[PDB]
Amino acid sequence: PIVQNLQGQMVHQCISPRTLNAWVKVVEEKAFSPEVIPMFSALSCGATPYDLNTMLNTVGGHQAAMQMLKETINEEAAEWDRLHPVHAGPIAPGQMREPRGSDIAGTTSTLQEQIGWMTHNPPIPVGEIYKRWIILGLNKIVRMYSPTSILDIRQGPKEPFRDYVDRFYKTLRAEQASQEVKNAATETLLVQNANPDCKTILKALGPGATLEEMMTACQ
Amino acid sequence: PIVQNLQGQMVHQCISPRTLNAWVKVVEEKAFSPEVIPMFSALSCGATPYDLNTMLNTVGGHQAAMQMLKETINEEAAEWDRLHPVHAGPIAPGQMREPRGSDIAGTTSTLQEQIGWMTHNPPIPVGEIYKRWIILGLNKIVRMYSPTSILDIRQGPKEPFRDYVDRFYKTLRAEQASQEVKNAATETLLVQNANPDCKTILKALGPGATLEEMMTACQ
Amino acid sequence: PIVQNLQGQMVHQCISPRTLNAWVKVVEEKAFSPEVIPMFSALSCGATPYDLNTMLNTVGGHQAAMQMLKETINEEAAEWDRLHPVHMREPRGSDIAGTTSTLQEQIGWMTHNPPIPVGEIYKRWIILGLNKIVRMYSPTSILDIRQGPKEPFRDYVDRFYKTLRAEQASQEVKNAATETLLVQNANPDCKTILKALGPGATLEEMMTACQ
Amino acid sequence: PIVQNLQGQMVHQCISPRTLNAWVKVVEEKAFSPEVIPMFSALSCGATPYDLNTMLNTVGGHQAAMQMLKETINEEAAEWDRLHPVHMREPRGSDIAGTTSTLQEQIGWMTHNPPIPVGEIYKRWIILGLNKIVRMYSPTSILDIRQGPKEPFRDYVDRFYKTLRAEQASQEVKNAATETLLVQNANPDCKTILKALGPGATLEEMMTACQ
Amino acid sequence: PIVQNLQGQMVHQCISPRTLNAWVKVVEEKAFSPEVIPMFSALSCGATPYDLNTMLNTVGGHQAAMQMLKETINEEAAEWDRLHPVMREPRGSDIAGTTSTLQEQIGWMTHNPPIPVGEIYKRWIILGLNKIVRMYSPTSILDIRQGPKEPFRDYVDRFYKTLRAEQASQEVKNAATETLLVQNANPDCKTILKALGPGATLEEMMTACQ
Amino acid sequence: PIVQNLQGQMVHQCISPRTLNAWVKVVEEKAFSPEVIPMFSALSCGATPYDLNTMLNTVGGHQAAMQMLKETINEEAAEWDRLHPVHMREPRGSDIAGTTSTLQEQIGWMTHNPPIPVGEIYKRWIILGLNKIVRMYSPTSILDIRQGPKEPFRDYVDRFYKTLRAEQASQEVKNAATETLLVQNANPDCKTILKALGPGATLEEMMTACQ
């Protein structure tokens, strides 16, 4: 985070012990369940790339994921370098140097420069850009660490329909399917993978049935 | 949440780790008991649509319920578009745009626009409007996840009357009864579903008996 | 709660997660023991009717008690309406309870000159309805609190004045019971010692005597 | 507690949920061990009589002690009335205890020139009444604290001065007991060593000698 | 602690429930292990004598140590009176907080020049606590000997833990690396340590016996 | 930490009890796992040398590590003295470590123009000394991390890059081992698949291949 002191100068505020401990415990408890990504975006709110690396470094295990996270950050950093060229004009007084991909990731940039890009006019939100790469790389990890595929989620003979749909849309969240696929799967794979008792009831409802009606029907 | 900084500018303050952890743990412990809904309204006090989505996304399980919650949000968003039409023509620079249904849900609107609408005179409470849609969709989930119907709540032979009334008005809360239906059932289903020993005492009290007198009578 | 922001405007501040969790856990743990009422009044300090309903609604179980609490709130609301006819607008009984009044209106009445403490009025009704619940949920009657043969006198007096608190006896009755029902319901060994002390004996001297 | 708001007006701020929960848990865990009194004085720092009653009312059990505590508060209130006749109004004994005085009046007396600290006066009565409870609830007397044959001297002295704190001994007795009752109640092995040290021995030298 | 209010007036702020509970639990858990002294100095940072006595009084057990702590406070108070004959000038009993109000203590602390009665009194408490830690140390440094199968890392943890409670100088701790640490090692690690020769850091010694 | 008071004067603010307890527990729980170092750099944010010593002194066990940490601090202090002769006074090595410098001087150097970041310089020495400890306390060598017969490849890579982190390998060494030692130490089933992928394979493609 960044704060303006009484002098009007933009200074780096330290990340609190509650936030650091919160981020450590959720990774310890939830590993890489899909809800970890919204929790990371919440705890790292308004953070600099320096603060984002602090939170990533504090994670103890899961170094296979962290090494993959670095590779995704390197790929996004090289993509930034390509389509943002480094202009040959002399650096205007009071304006900062143009942010490079490695500067946004925080490897080759100081904390003062990061505050400079974030607070100057126009602002270059290197914190938000870098967090976009991290969440992007974390989504890939969640997709890989997902144990079951959506095609294998089939309802049991005695399993309640409510529990089956919980597993179905849990798997669909880890596989990071689009929202339209999630809405579409209601009338396609969800009915197909149901047991013969619920499937007969679901087909009788016909097309265009909301999930509310489908769970009421198999109750 | 929103805060007025030292300059007097309305800035978005981070949702605290205490609030986030509180909302996560209540969903883990209480699932979808009726008291979860007041807890959400309390924890999400003064939140932007961005903050409401943060709280909803951090929920780990119950993806069947969350998928139904999305459908109810889409239905309320489309209803907003119907009776508040928006002329989405190109708007002059610096001019607040009229809130669309998807803007209230937070999918197609920035965090700055949401603060703009909320801290306006007169205020356009996109945070409160969106919370109304969420609680509306949450009440439907509680009704569905309610296991027993009010008609099946019958007092046992040796069960104390106090415990039976605890179960009765708990079931009646999940089934989302009106206050008049809850007040009226005191002289209808509560007496009818009582055991023969207490029912004889309750009929002797006659009409117009408060719940206080009924519980004293069967003690 | 209510706060004055930097601008000088009276704004509603959100009830903290600590208070909400504190009030939920004490109802979960203590149910309706007499010490829950002072805990409620303490946690709901300076609250609007909106905040009071939030704390009451967050209670999970005990819906029999909450339904009785509504009836006591409705009875007090009609009594307010009878004593205050309706011609900022003057608060109606349902406005004090928070059913037919906005959060801005409640802040208006509380931060007015002269102030109309709708929060304190409504909390007075809530504590009133909660006291009836504590009396009802009291398991034993004060007449049934009798000291055991091997029970220490200290424990018997702990049970005695605990029951007397749930039955909502007056402070004067509580002071008076020291020489009447407390001595009468004691076991024979301590009762002989208590009568030897005579009239006008403090509880300090009584518990020292049966030690 | 009391706070000066933005306007400069002294307003009552609510006691925090941390403080209330802290005071509840210590009474549940420690009952009436001597350290509960300094814990009470710390948590109730700068409190009004209203806040002191809030903390006292939130205590769940120990109603025998709470009933004795009321009697000590009444006795100190009557002593105040005798030394201070009643003609801002002058605070009477029942006003200091907080039964017959509003929260605004209590703020008036505390934030006055010259200040009448009814909060500190009432806390002095409470701590006085609580010390009587700790003195009574002490299980063993100082004369019965004797060192075992195999008990280490360190543990015996821990028990000795723990009892002496609950028995609310004076500072002089605590210093003096080092050379009298601490040596007298020691076991024959340590007592022989303690007498060899002679007069005027600090507790440091006595515990080093029996190590 | 002390705070400057909105008016600019120095008022005493209440010690927080977190701090009090923190100080109570560390004494319950750690008893009088050497790290309790720095924990006390940190939690009682900027405290008045009134606040220091609040923290000392809240300790439940260990009244033998607390009684010894009182005697050391009395001895240091008499030493202050001998060097300083008698705003009023603070006497020894005023620094300990027995014969001085909370307003006087704030007066001395927020004075020009400041009379740090809080820092002076904390120096006496830490001094008396150091004596307690030295006494409550169970083993002597001479009895800390490495086992036959004990790892060298664990032996050095015990060695310098004992050496901390026995309150050895910083120089004594550094010098013992090649003297008593090697002498009290097992014959397998001792042979390795002597081969390293003089002037070996603790890093090289633990790598050698790994 | 350092704060600017209302007057504009730079004063030292107390290290919070949350921070102190956080740093103590992570050392109790994690000992000297590699993630302890970023946790230390985060908890000691903006701290003076006095505050850094407070955090180091509060550590209870691991005195073997703390004694080695002192030796590394002494070595870096002597290196500072060699590169900076001593003629506000200029900070010497022992002043940066905080042994021979007051808290006011440390604030003087830190809050000055130009700033002499004695807090950041001293923290650089501590993290340097902690990195040496983590390398020593690492149990297994990278050469011994071999995948089992039935072990999933994901778990083997977790162990591999955990060991590689404690040994404080460079980023290039971590990147290079993906196609070198990680493939060599895999089991015969996964190694056959990994060689078939050929050169230039990311870790993502390797873990998908052995799934």
Numbering used by the authors:
A (entry chain A), B (entry chain F): 1 to 219
C (entry chain E), D (entry chain D), F (entry chain B): 1 to 87, 96 to 219
E (entry chain C): 1 to 86, 96 to 219
Task: Provide the authors' own sentences about this structure as they appear in the paper.
HIV capsid has a pivotal role in regulating viral DNA synthesis and shielding viral DNA from cytosolic sensors. Previously reported X-ray structures of HIV-1(M) CA hexamers showed two distinct conformations with respect to a channel at the 6-fold symmetry axis. The beta hairpin structure (BHP) above the channel can assume ‘open’ (His12 forms a salt bridge with Asp51) or ‘closed positions’ (with a bridging water molecule between His12 and Asp51). Inside the channel, 6 positively charged arginines (R18) are hypothesized to mediate electrostatic nucleotide recruitment to fuel encapsidated DNA synthesis.
To probe the role of CA50 in infectivity, we made HIV-1(M) CA Q50Y, reverting the glutamine to the ancestral tyrosine. Solving the mutant hexamer structure confirmed that HIV-1(M) CA Q50Y hexamers adopted ‘open’ conformations, and the hinge region of HIV-1(M) Q50Y resembled HIV-1(O) and SIVmac. Importantly, and unlike other capsid point mutants, for example, CA K25A which prevents IP6 recruitment into assembling virions, HIV-1(M) Q50Y capsids were not intrinsically destabilized, showing WT disassembly kinetics in the absence of IP6 in single-molecule uncoating assays. As expected, given the similar structure, addition of IP6 led to an increase in the HIV-1(M) Q50Y capsid half-life from minutes to hours for the majority of capsids, confirming that IP6 binding was not perturbed. Nevertheless, in infection experiments, single-round infectivity of HIV-1(M) GFP CA Q50Y was reduced and this capsid mutant did not replicate in MDM.
